[PDB]
Amino acid sequence: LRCQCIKTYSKHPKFIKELRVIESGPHCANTEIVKLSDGRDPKENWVQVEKFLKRAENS
Amino acid sequence: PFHPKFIKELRVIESGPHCANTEIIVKLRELCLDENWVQRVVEKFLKR
Amino acid sequence: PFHPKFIKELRVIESGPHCANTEIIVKLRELCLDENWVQRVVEKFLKR
Amino acid sequence: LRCQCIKTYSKHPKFIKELRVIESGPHCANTEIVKLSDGRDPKENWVQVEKFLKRAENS
Amino acid sequence: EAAAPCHSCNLLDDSALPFFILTSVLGILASSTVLFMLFRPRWQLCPGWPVLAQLAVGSALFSIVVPVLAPGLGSTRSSALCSLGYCVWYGSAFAQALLLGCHASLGHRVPGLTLGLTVGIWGVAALLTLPVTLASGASGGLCTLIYSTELKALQATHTVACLAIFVLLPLGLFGAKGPWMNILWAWFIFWWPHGVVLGLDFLVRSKLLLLSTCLAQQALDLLLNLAEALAILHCVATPLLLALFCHQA
Amino acid sequence: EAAAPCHSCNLLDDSALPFFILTSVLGILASSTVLFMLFRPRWQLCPGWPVLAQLAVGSALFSIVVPVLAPGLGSTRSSALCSLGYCVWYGSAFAQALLLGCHASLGHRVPGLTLGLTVGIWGVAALLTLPVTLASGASGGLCTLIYSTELKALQATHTVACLAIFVLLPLGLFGAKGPWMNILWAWFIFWWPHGVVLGLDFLVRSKLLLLSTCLAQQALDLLLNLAEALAILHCVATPLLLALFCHQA
């Protein structure tokens, strides 16, 4: 029920492997999970993913 | 070639050792994707 | 002797020649009437 | 539908033979027929019936 | 010179079955036919189909109930029987009128657009028939609407609601100043005499009108009974109009 | 050190029939039993009997509809199917709440007092479920209430109506300051958790509350699913309570 990751925290860019895309939703009422190297926002400068996509830009 | 509109959720996985390819997941029928029409949707859909 | 309350309409006919008796009609079961209990209702029912 | 005799007008007392009693009703909405000799209100002096009842007071 | 004998029970006293029970049975037959043709499907292509299906179901209920309130049937009718008959009768009338109005406002135009609209339309139709079923009864053995000071407020609410939905609602639509064919306006043509005659009887019984002679009272009773007959004929009237509506698209 | 992952589908994901379909079938059986026992008469002596009969009929409809919105059934459910399921579900809930209320106000207390009251109560119950059936759907294959800015007004209306009738209506009755036994208060004991949890989820989704840790979100989802289960159990719950009510007079 509804989107998640409501504990948005300001502080690695080189320790990012996993993510998902969920922005809107019929029950989602927030804006948004990312996994670190060991397992653990468009407004942010370095976060705004696109560059990480360019690290996998073959597809 | 099919409809690009009613795709709801997206995901991306970096090609780590077990992942021989950069697997990106799009779910609304959730099928793995690793073309001229493959990248024809991505930017607008991310904006959509 | 019966209930005097649920009688709704009343009528009276003067005893002319074809009428051998002063027939008064009360209808709510409409039965003709020509006693100690016959006159026990009349005034209050007319007021009722 | 509803009670009748809504043409109440001024006016024989000796030419009265037939009448009926209908005062209220589920559809009756005014206050009230009398037949003359040849065939044709409590506030009125001689109309206020009771005296005519005394002309048949055996019952 | 000044006499006031005057009375009537016009054109509907005891002829009975030649006019009502035959009509009621034929109406239930026609309504079941047009209902059990949609449930057994070209007949599944109606735009706004469930609104029309409910318009036929209301006619089916009206046909089933016509003999309950019609004269010539069994006397000593329970006040609850007449109350229920009036309830479903005027409720079907209100529901058909409201569905026709909503279809005339939302013809061309969410999954709930069909169920939400229909549930709201009955609910409001079932609410609008509160005064008539509350102010109802069978005095003397005949189904009769209650119009007296004992139930003055309920009768007043009932008559203003009936007048609105039956003659001022179509007149209100007539103030719209093209997608206005409304091939189902014959229903309100059927029902407007009833509403205007109900308003006139409201004025006459409460005595705020100008009825001069027993001609006026005689014509009032005659038009009352004629309005009852013309309203009762709707049960057999509607299914043919619904076939026309289905064949008009 | 500051990570934000957590997700839950608590206690109702795929166990399915062991708790819902079996419950739905047993509820339809019990409700048909307590409905056809009144239709086949000591059992015709209920004060305000048709109000209780409709309280049983609402439970029968709820039992018939529980598998429609329950998890574990066929996926790819039509949005119309979920909309209809939610409509009849919450409409039966509203009607049982609203008839309970009128019976609690008009217990000891015209021929239309039975039909007028019941027609008004459904009509208002059918009107109160307009927002939920309008703001309904099945996104991804599961029956889900629509809570988004696209349907913000309808969801707000739905939650205030549900809160009122389910926790403010019993609390409103609790302000009455004896003929207040209310042996059917267990129904609103069943339904108050659902109302308060709906209000809390409305506050949380609107981000107008104080959920500080993910423990709050986990408990919110857990209580949401628990409220759904405890509300769905009403379909099998009510018939025994209605037998108790019939045996209590």
XYZ file of C-alpha atoms in Angstrom:
712
model
C 0.000 0.000 0.000
C 1.377 3.363 -1.188
C 4.968 4.092 -2.183
C 7.806 3.834 0.323
C 11.269 5.184 1.196
C 9.937 8.076 3.295
C 13.184 8.388 5.284
C 14.987 10.420 2.609
C 18.400 11.197 4.089
C 21.115 13.683 3.179
C 24.633 12.308 3.612
C 28.529 6.341 -2.009
C 28.140 7.249 -5.685
C 30.675 4.496 -6.438
C 28.818 1.980 -4.237
C 25.499 1.825 -6.124
C 24.312 -1.390 -7.774
C 20.528 -1.768 -7.464
C 17.550 0.577 -7.739
C 13.915 0.781 -8.829
C 11.620 3.351 -10.436
C 8.333 4.195 -8.716
C 7.181 7.821 -8.894
C 3.364 7.927 -8.963
C 0.689 5.369 -8.185
C -3.002 4.826 -7.464
C -2.109 4.496 -3.771
C 1.345 6.105 -3.894
C 1.255 9.562 -2.303
C 4.986 10.357 -2.103
C 7.996 10.634 -4.439
C 10.569 7.838 -4.559
C 14.863 2.281 -2.973
C 18.594 1.974 -3.674
C 21.012 -0.752 -2.580
C 24.605 -0.096 -1.533
C 27.599 -2.293 -2.368
C 27.130 -4.560 0.667
C 23.328 -4.274 0.712
C 21.495 -1.423 2.426
C 15.741 11.811 -5.903
C 15.637 13.900 -9.094
C 16.310 17.063 -7.065
C 19.754 15.952 -5.865
C 22.763 17.033 -7.908
C 24.794 13.838 -8.310
C 21.893 11.445 -7.676
C 20.009 12.799 -10.697
C 21.013 7.411 -12.056
C 21.266 8.992 -15.504
C 25.052 8.908 -15.165
C 24.764 5.442 -13.624
C 22.708 4.520 -16.688
C 25.620 5.831 -18.766
C 27.768 3.346 -16.828
C 25.516 0.708 -18.443
C 24.780 2.667 -21.658
C 25.148 -0.347 -23.994
C 21.383 -0.875 -23.712
C 7.441 -3.111 -31.467
C 4.413 -2.705 -29.186
C 2.644 -0.094 -27.078
C 5.052 1.886 -24.832
C 2.376 3.751 -22.854
C 0.980 1.455 -20.137
C 4.351 0.486 -18.627
C 4.183 1.541 -14.976
C 7.321 0.543 -13.039
C 10.977 0.346 -14.047
C 14.187 -1.013 -12.551
C 17.874 -1.328 -13.438
C 20.553 -3.762 -12.235
C 24.272 -3.235 -12.803
C 26.097 -6.089 -14.556
C 27.837 -7.617 -11.547
C 29.528 -11.016 -11.670
C 26.355 -13.117 -11.494
C 24.616 -10.708 -13.902
C 26.326 -11.280 -17.249
C 24.232 -8.428 -18.702
C 22.875 -5.118 -17.421
C 19.391 -6.375 -16.565
C 16.703 -3.673 -16.458
C 13.217 -4.622 -15.245
C 10.031 -2.914 -16.447
C 6.715 -3.996 -14.917
C 3.194 -2.629 -15.290
C 3.899 -8.841 -17.568
C 7.385 -8.284 -16.122
C 10.020 -9.371 -18.645
C 13.781 -8.950 -18.435
C 15.547 -6.676 -20.912
C 19.305 -6.510 -21.427
C 17.905 -1.910 -30.683
C 16.552 0.998 -32.705
C 13.254 0.655 -30.818
C 14.756 -0.447 -27.488
C 16.032 3.054 -26.664
C 13.177 4.817 -28.486
C 11.028 4.894 -25.325
C 13.436 5.171 -22.386
C 13.837 8.941 -22.021
C 10.178 9.860 -22.553
C 8.935 6.978 -20.389
C 11.255 8.073 -17.580
C 9.751 11.524 -18.078
C 6.304 9.898 -18.403
C -72.922 -3.777 21.941
C -69.733 -3.285 19.907
C -67.012 -0.730 19.228
C -68.371 2.818 18.676
C -65.079 4.426 17.620
C -64.286 3.402 14.025
C -67.588 4.632 12.538
C -66.712 7.306 9.975
C -69.795 8.546 8.088
C -73.394 9.077 9.183
C -76.723 9.789 7.506
C -80.371 10.288 8.460
C -83.568 9.889 6.413
C -86.953 11.235 7.492
C -89.772 8.677 7.676
C -91.726 9.618 4.590
C -94.263 7.304 2.977
C -91.930 4.645 1.392
C -89.819 4.823 4.576
C -91.881 3.206 7.320
C -89.134 4.073 9.834
C -86.691 6.934 10.324
C -83.725 5.223 8.671
C -80.288 6.505 9.708
C -77.239 5.221 7.819
C -73.800 4.928 9.431
C -70.884 3.780 7.265
C -67.165 3.524 7.973
C -70.053 -2.375 6.846
C -72.978 -0.026 6.156
C -76.055 -1.319 7.989
C -79.419 0.386 8.384
C -80.626 1.437 11.831
C -84.182 2.444 12.712
C -82.238 1.044 22.848
C -80.247 1.863 25.976
C -77.068 1.477 23.897
C -78.475 2.798 20.604
C -78.461 6.416 21.822
C -75.371 5.940 24.014
C -73.027 6.901 21.151
C -74.921 9.418 19.009
C -74.039 12.738 20.656
C -70.353 11.980 21.251
C -69.917 10.401 17.810
C -71.457 13.487 16.203
C -68.945 15.445 18.271
C -66.288 12.838 17.394
C -61.800 12.411 -4.095
C -62.176 14.828 -1.156
C -65.438 15.979 0.410
C -67.874 18.118 -1.551
C -70.589 20.798 -1.343
C -68.172 23.720 -1.732
C -70.898 26.092 -3.005
C -72.103 26.995 0.484
C -74.608 29.836 0.176
C -77.228 31.642 2.232
C -80.301 29.378 2.280
C -86.793 25.773 3.678
C -86.476 24.419 7.221
C -89.856 22.726 6.690
C -88.733 21.289 3.331
C -85.856 19.120 4.598
C -85.931 15.334 4.234
C -82.476 13.932 3.433
C -78.911 14.656 4.536
C -75.537 13.047 5.216
C -72.658 13.507 7.655
C -69.123 13.923 6.310
C -66.823 16.264 8.234
C -63.198 15.090 7.953
C -61.383 12.602 5.758
C -57.994 11.469 4.460
C -58.697 13.440 1.272
C -61.598 15.555 2.571
C -60.308 19.117 2.832
C -63.328 21.326 3.591
C -66.357 21.163 5.897
C -69.696 19.691 4.832
C -75.360 17.549 1.068
C -79.029 18.214 1.844
C -82.109 17.384 -0.228
C -85.178 19.615 -0.425
C -88.800 18.450 -0.565
C -88.817 18.051 -4.360
C -85.149 17.040 -4.607
C -82.334 19.582 -4.792
C -73.196 24.263 9.199
C -73.073 24.445 13.007
C -72.665 28.236 12.855
C -76.076 28.842 11.267
C -78.953 29.523 13.646
C -81.689 27.201 12.381
C -79.435 24.812 10.450
C -77.751 23.849 13.727
C -80.078 18.958 12.119
C -80.347 18.508 15.884
C -83.854 19.977 15.773
C -84.595 17.826 12.722
C -83.247 14.901 14.745
C -85.805 15.827 17.412
C -88.412 15.523 14.645
C -87.322 11.857 14.530
C -86.281 11.549 18.210
C -87.862 8.101 18.735
C -84.494 6.575 17.809
C -81.788 28.469 -6.461
C -78.566 27.986 -4.437
C -77.971 24.238 -4.288
C -74.637 22.395 -4.104
C -75.068 18.731 -5.005
C -72.055 17.575 -6.946
C -70.089 14.338 -7.036
C -68.240 11.946 -9.297
C -66.187 8.758 -9.592
C -65.272 9.260 -13.227
C -64.378 6.648 -15.847
C -62.588 4.377 -13.351
C -64.945 2.779 -10.838
C -65.535 -0.900 -11.575
C -64.676 -1.636 -15.229
C -61.407 -2.993 -13.802
C -59.752 -5.809 -15.745
C -60.596 -4.589 -19.311
C -58.276 -1.669 -18.549
C -55.825 -2.477 -15.730
C -55.295 -6.193 -15.026
C -55.079 -6.932 -18.740
C -52.768 -3.924 -19.064
C -50.738 -5.011 -16.027
C -50.285 -8.572 -17.307
C -49.418 -7.409 -20.825
C -46.941 -4.938 -19.336
C -45.234 -7.549 -17.179
C -45.019 -9.765 -20.274
C -43.530 -7.020 -22.453
C -41.127 -5.868 -19.729
C -39.939 -9.413 -19.036
C -39.475 -9.839 -22.793
C -37.361 -6.688 -23.173
C -35.463 -7.534 -19.971
C -34.878 -11.207 -20.810
C -33.751 -10.219 -24.358
C -30.913 -8.069 -23.017
C -29.925 -10.923 -20.684
C -29.989 -13.282 -23.708
C -27.899 -11.656 -26.476
C -26.893 -6.403 -31.757
C -28.751 -6.162 -28.440
C -25.525 -5.772 -26.423
C -24.492 -2.587 -28.278
C -26.674 -0.051 -26.461
C -24.754 3.114 -25.473
C -25.347 3.618 -21.776
C -26.981 0.188 -21.777
C -27.567 -0.371 -18.008
C -29.418 2.944 -17.648
C -31.900 1.745 -20.271
C -31.976 -1.721 -18.687
C -32.972 -0.114 -15.390
C -35.526 1.999 -17.267
C -37.083 -1.293 -18.403
C -36.787 -2.889 -14.949
C -38.685 0.042 -13.464
C -41.452 -0.560 -15.990
C -41.442 -4.238 -15.000
C -41.903 -3.327 -11.331
C -44.648 -0.862 -12.264
C -46.416 -3.556 -14.297
C -46.134 -6.012 -11.408
C -47.620 -3.448 -9.015
C -50.423 -1.915 -11.146
C -53.033 -4.535 -10.082
C -52.192 -3.894 -6.411
C -53.424 -0.289 -6.554
C -55.967 -0.740 -9.354
C -59.705 -0.771 -8.603
C -61.781 -3.875 -9.197
C -59.429 -6.222 -7.332
C -59.911 -7.594 -3.816
C -61.333 -5.110 -1.325
C -60.266 -4.698 2.324
C -56.762 -3.942 1.072
C -54.219 -3.600 3.864
C -52.861 -0.093 4.362
C -49.406 -1.657 4.090
C -50.349 -3.163 0.713
C -51.402 0.200 -0.730
C -48.395 1.897 0.877
C -46.017 -0.606 -0.732
C -47.784 -0.347 -4.073
C -47.589 3.445 -4.073
C -43.965 3.261 -2.919
C -42.795 1.062 -5.787
C -45.094 2.786 -8.318
C -43.938 6.345 -7.701
C -40.392 5.119 -7.059
C -40.252 3.530 -10.503
C -41.688 6.744 -11.944
C -39.059 8.843 -10.144
C -36.255 6.456 -11.107
C -37.216 6.408 -14.786
C -37.454 10.207 -14.811
C -34.085 10.599 -13.081
C -32.376 8.064 -15.350
C -33.792 9.841 -18.405
C -32.560 13.195 -17.105
C -29.089 11.886 -16.284
C -28.878 10.195 -19.691
C -29.919 13.471 -21.335
C -27.132 15.236 -19.417
C -24.499 12.460 -19.643
C -25.276 10.919 -23.026
C -21.948 11.124 -24.840
C -19.948 10.967 -21.596
C -14.100 5.741 -14.850
C -15.321 2.191 -14.135
C -17.864 3.555 -11.656
C -19.564 5.781 -14.231
C -22.147 3.022 -14.763
C -22.568 1.652 -11.228
C -22.045 4.966 -9.436
C -24.585 6.765 -11.607
C -27.199 4.027 -11.237
C -26.723 3.646 -7.478
C -27.004 7.406 -7.013
C -30.085 7.591 -9.239
C -32.010 4.962 -7.376
C -30.879 6.245 -4.038
C -32.226 9.693 -4.893
C -35.343 8.130 -6.443
C -35.877 6.022 -3.320
C -35.410 9.140 -1.190
C -37.833 11.207 -3.285
C -40.598 8.642 -2.702
C -40.281 8.947 1.092
C -43.153 11.481 1.385
C -45.588 9.532 -0.791
C -45.032 6.202 0.969
C -45.187 7.964 4.338
C -48.318 9.883 3.297
C -50.207 6.909 1.887
C -53.036 4.599 2.840
C -56.241 2.830 1.851
C -59.255 4.543 3.414
C -62.472 2.655 2.715
C -60.742 -0.079 0.698
C -59.216 1.957 -2.154
C -55.599 3.042 -2.564
C -55.655 6.768 -1.784
C -53.011 9.445 -1.345
C -53.213 11.231 2.009
C -54.003 14.951 1.644
C -55.069 16.502 4.954
C -53.935 18.719 7.715
C -52.913 15.658 9.741
C -50.340 14.884 7.017
C -50.164 18.357 5.483
C -46.371 18.681 5.479
C -45.754 15.252 3.939
C -48.374 15.839 1.241
C -46.913 19.276 0.476
C -43.403 17.809 0.111
C -44.780 14.971 -2.009
C -46.598 17.294 -4.389
C -43.701 19.720 -4.813
C -41.339 16.810 -5.513
C -43.771 15.287 -8.016
C -44.390 18.656 -9.674
C -40.663 19.344 -9.952
C -39.545 15.980 -11.300
C -42.566 15.556 -13.589
C -43.392 18.974 -15.098
C -40.703 21.409 -13.887
C -37.833 19.005 -14.564
C -38.853 18.678 -18.253
C -39.674 22.393 -18.271
C -36.311 23.001 -16.612
C -34.668 21.057 -19.423
C -36.751 23.168 -21.823
C -34.845 26.216 -20.580
C -31.620 24.921 -22.134
C -30.577 27.614 -24.611
C -28.022 19.810 -31.719
C -27.729 16.853 -29.342
C -31.281 17.320 -28.040
C -33.302 14.732 -29.978
C -34.645 13.116 -26.781
C -36.729 10.414 -28.456
C -37.734 9.463 -24.901
C -39.550 12.747 -24.229
C -42.796 10.812 -24.721
C -42.319 9.521 -21.169
C -42.528 13.039 -19.743
C -45.353 13.759 -22.194
C -47.089 10.861 -20.450
C -46.278 12.106 -16.950
C -46.700 15.909 -17.189
C -50.556 15.786 -17.109
C -50.255 13.831 -13.867
C -47.942 16.393 -12.277
C -49.946 19.447 -13.317
C -53.212 17.805 -12.244
C -51.623 16.924 -8.900
C -50.619 20.564 -8.463
C -54.110 21.730 -9.385
C -55.660 19.273 -6.913
C -53.221 20.509 -4.263
C -54.415 24.064 -4.907
C -58.100 23.080 -4.982
C -58.086 20.910 -1.848
C -56.134 23.465 0.190
C -58.493 26.102 -1.295
C -56.093 28.622 -2.835
C -57.625 28.422 -6.330
C -60.557 29.879 -8.275
C -62.862 26.923 -8.948
C -66.201 28.596 -9.666
C -68.835 25.915 -10.492
C -69.410 22.168 -10.262
C -68.133 22.073 -13.833
C -64.724 22.931 -12.374
C -64.935 20.144 -9.790
C -66.293 17.678 -12.349
C -63.463 18.471 -14.774
C -60.931 18.245 -11.940
C -62.084 14.732 -11.020
C -62.299 13.738 -14.696
C -58.758 14.961 -15.384
C -57.553 13.300 -12.171
C -58.856 9.901 -13.275
C -57.641 10.475 -16.840
C -54.170 11.307 -15.506
C -54.198 8.126 -13.420
C -55.117 6.067 -16.491
C -52.535 7.756 -18.726
C -49.836 7.260 -16.079
C -50.770 3.600 -15.583
C -50.451 3.026 -19.337
C -46.711 3.784 -19.067
C -46.044 0.199 -17.945
C -47.035 -1.117 -21.367
C -45.792 2.037 -23.116
C -42.089 2.025 -22.225
C -40.771 -1.300 -23.680
C -41.652 -0.325 -27.263
C -39.940 3.030 -26.743
C -36.888 1.183 -25.427
C -36.817 -1.001 -28.533
C -36.971 2.234 -30.541
C -34.066 3.658 -28.529
C -32.020 0.493 -29.080
C -32.744 0.633 -32.826
C -32.075 4.391 -33.050
C -28.305 4.176 -32.491
C 23.868 4.705 8.494
C 20.660 6.354 7.227
C 18.970 3.915 4.859
C 15.286 3.927 3.988
C 14.225 0.411 2.861
C 11.078 -1.406 3.968
C 8.040 -3.050 2.350
C 5.187 -5.256 3.483
C 2.159 -7.292 2.406
C 1.223 -8.394 5.901
C -0.709 -11.536 6.834
C -2.881 -11.420 3.693
C -0.887 -12.188 0.555
C -1.603 -15.686 -0.738
C -3.004 -17.853 2.087
C -6.384 -17.098 0.480
C -9.107 -19.724 0.860
C -8.175 -21.015 4.381
C -9.423 -17.631 5.628
C -11.594 -15.864 3.014
C -13.217 -18.169 0.446
C -14.130 -20.675 3.150
C -15.321 -17.738 5.255
C -17.304 -16.321 2.323
C -18.999 -19.650 1.566
C -19.793 -20.302 5.230
C -21.165 -16.768 5.495
C -23.418 -17.152 2.469
C -24.633 -20.450 3.946
C -25.343 -18.941 7.370
C -26.967 -15.823 5.903
C -29.182 -17.855 3.574
C -30.105 -19.996 6.587
C -31.094 -17.018 8.752
C -32.854 -15.394 5.780
C -34.897 -18.421 4.673
C -35.756 -19.238 8.289
C -37.590 -15.913 8.537
C -39.232 -16.612 5.164
C -40.251 -20.068 6.478
C -41.914 -19.547 9.891
C -41.675 -17.748 17.276
C -39.525 -16.472 14.400
C -42.139 -13.951 13.174
C -42.198 -12.017 16.468
C -39.171 -9.740 16.005
C -39.876 -6.103 16.987
C -38.907 -4.104 13.941
C -38.505 -7.400 12.097
C -37.761 -6.142 8.529
C -34.898 -3.955 9.777
C -33.225 -7.074 11.174
C -34.137 -9.028 8.031
C -32.345 -6.390 5.964
C -29.436 -6.552 8.418
C -29.199 -10.248 7.516
C -29.642 -9.588 3.783
C -26.763 -7.116 3.861
C -24.584 -9.792 5.438
C -25.701 -12.192 2.698
C -24.635 -9.722 0.002
C -21.332 -9.145 1.801
C -20.742 -12.906 1.974
C -21.551 -13.272 -1.725
C -19.102 -10.492 -2.601
C -16.174 -11.297 -0.251
C -14.462 -13.662 -2.762
C -14.692 -10.977 -5.469
C -12.330 -8.642 -3.595
C -10.448 -11.348 -1.686
C -6.828 -12.210 -2.519
C -5.936 -15.592 -3.958
C -8.702 -15.675 -6.577
C -8.280 -15.135 -10.318
C -5.942 -12.302 -11.270
C -6.507 -9.752 -14.063
C -9.695 -8.704 -12.284
C -11.724 -6.179 -14.255
C -11.800 -2.699 -12.750
C -15.588 -2.923 -13.006
C -15.529 -6.160 -10.990
C -13.544 -4.590 -8.144
C -15.653 -1.424 -8.322
C -18.854 -3.460 -7.997
C -17.376 -5.533 -5.188
C -16.344 -2.474 -3.193
C -19.679 -0.790 -3.911
C -21.812 -3.630 -2.566
C -19.356 -4.365 0.277
C -19.253 -0.844 1.686
C -22.933 -0.313 0.864
C -23.905 -3.321 2.964
C -21.611 -2.019 5.704
C -23.224 1.434 5.542
C -26.752 0.003 5.480
C -26.131 -2.287 8.449
C -24.617 0.675 10.305
C -27.425 3.054 9.335
C -30.285 0.631 10.131
C -28.661 -0.204 13.340
C -28.700 3.531 14.060
C -32.365 4.058 13.219
C -33.313 0.975 15.239
C -31.263 2.363 18.135
C -33.207 5.634 17.873
C -36.628 4.207 16.898
C -36.679 0.953 18.857
C -39.896 1.238 20.851
C -41.534 3.503 18.253
C -48.130 4.764 10.278
C -48.118 1.897 7.752
C -45.057 3.391 6.055
C -42.933 3.309 9.211
C -41.467 -0.007 8.012
C -41.162 0.594 4.259
C -40.418 4.315 4.514
C -37.633 3.792 7.040
C -36.045 0.949 5.074
C -36.261 2.733 1.717
C -34.731 5.871 3.219
C -31.979 3.869 4.921
C -30.856 2.099 1.806
C -31.183 5.205 -0.274
C -28.868 7.050 2.105
C -26.595 3.994 2.334
C -26.487 3.753 -1.466
C -25.706 7.474 -1.636
C -22.945 7.243 0.983
C -21.120 4.600 -1.081
C -20.941 6.895 -4.130
C -17.365 8.035 -3.320
C -15.932 4.554 -2.751
C -17.406 3.080 -5.934
C -16.370 6.186 -7.873
C -12.897 6.148 -6.286
C -12.273 2.440 -6.794
C -10.245 0.180 -9.031
C -7.859 -2.746 -9.352
C -4.311 -1.612 -10.111
C -2.005 -4.550 -10.786
C -4.746 -7.152 -10.289
C -5.791 -6.481 -6.675
C -8.867 -4.635 -5.420
C -7.505 -1.299 -4.198
C -9.058 1.940 -3.000
C -7.970 4.960 -5.039
C -5.944 7.384 -2.885
C -4.178 9.932 -5.093
C -4.304 13.600 -6.046
C -6.075 12.547 -9.251
C -9.003 11.376 -7.086
C -8.179 13.401 -3.977
C -11.639 14.897 -3.454
C -13.486 11.589 -3.844
C -11.085 9.811 -1.486
C -11.407 12.623 1.068
C -15.201 12.387 0.920
C -15.045 8.600 1.218
C -12.787 8.659 4.261
C -14.761 11.337 6.099
C -18.003 9.439 5.437
C -16.484 6.135 6.577
C -14.960 7.762 9.658
C -18.257 9.422 10.564
C -20.492 6.386 10.130
C -18.028 3.850 11.577
C -16.264 5.577 14.498
C -17.932 8.994 14.859
C -21.463 7.598 14.570
C -20.914 5.140 17.475
C -18.918 7.782 19.349
C -21.695 10.230 18.501
C -24.177 7.817 20.049
C -21.789 7.569 23.014
C -22.443 11.253 23.704
C -26.040 10.490 24.688
C -26.365 11.669 28.292
C -31.986 2.474 30.537
C -32.986 1.695 26.935
C -29.372 1.625 25.729
C -28.554 -2.084 25.944
C -27.529 -2.242 22.262
C -26.628 -5.932 22.138
C -25.655 -5.213 18.518
C -22.826 -2.849 19.481
C -20.422 -5.669 18.589
C -20.999 -4.708 14.947
C -19.501 -1.264 15.489
C -16.829 -2.851 17.686
C -15.968 -4.853 14.566
C -16.023 -1.783 12.325
C -14.390 0.943 14.470
C -10.801 -0.376 13.947
C -11.407 -0.164 10.204
C -12.608 3.435 10.402
C -9.814 4.668 12.658
C -7.185 2.857 10.580
C -8.646 4.394 7.422
C -8.381 7.832 9.019
C -4.793 7.166 10.092
C -3.875 5.963 6.590
C -5.539 9.045 5.088
C -3.417 11.200 7.398
C -0.245 9.241 6.585
C -0.752 9.291 2.805
C -1.439 13.035 2.922
C 1.821 13.337 4.929
C -0.027 15.197 7.697
C 1.013 12.909 10.567
C 4.017 12.017 12.730
C 5.234 8.609 11.525
C 8.812 8.826 12.798
C 10.344 5.387 12.105
C 9.692 2.559 9.667
C 8.197 0.731 12.652
C 5.283 3.150 12.231
C 4.861 2.179 8.568
C 5.111 -1.539 9.352
C 2.516 -1.238 12.116
C 0.293 0.844 9.827
C 0.300 -1.842 7.130
C -0.152 -4.586 9.739
C -3.155 -2.830 11.286
C -4.542 -2.093 7.810
C -4.539 -5.779 6.874
C -5.819 -6.763 10.323
C -8.696 -4.293 9.938
C -9.516 -5.746 6.518
C -9.630 -9.255 7.992
C -11.692 -8.226 11.025
C -14.146 -6.384 8.767
C -14.435 -9.321 6.357
C -15.261 -11.617 9.287
C -18.509 -9.659 9.794
C -20.209 -11.695 7.050
C -20.020 -14.825 9.194
C -20.325 -12.821 12.424
C -23.730 -11.166 12.017
C -26.195 -14.119 11.660
C -25.405 -15.449 15.147
C -25.880 -11.947 16.551
C -29.233 -11.719 14.766
C -30.297 -15.033 16.289
C -29.297 -13.565 19.659
C -31.370 -10.449 18.945
C -34.373 -12.582 17.977
C -33.992 -14.625 21.179
C -33.431 -11.534 23.360
C -36.991 -10.168 23.154
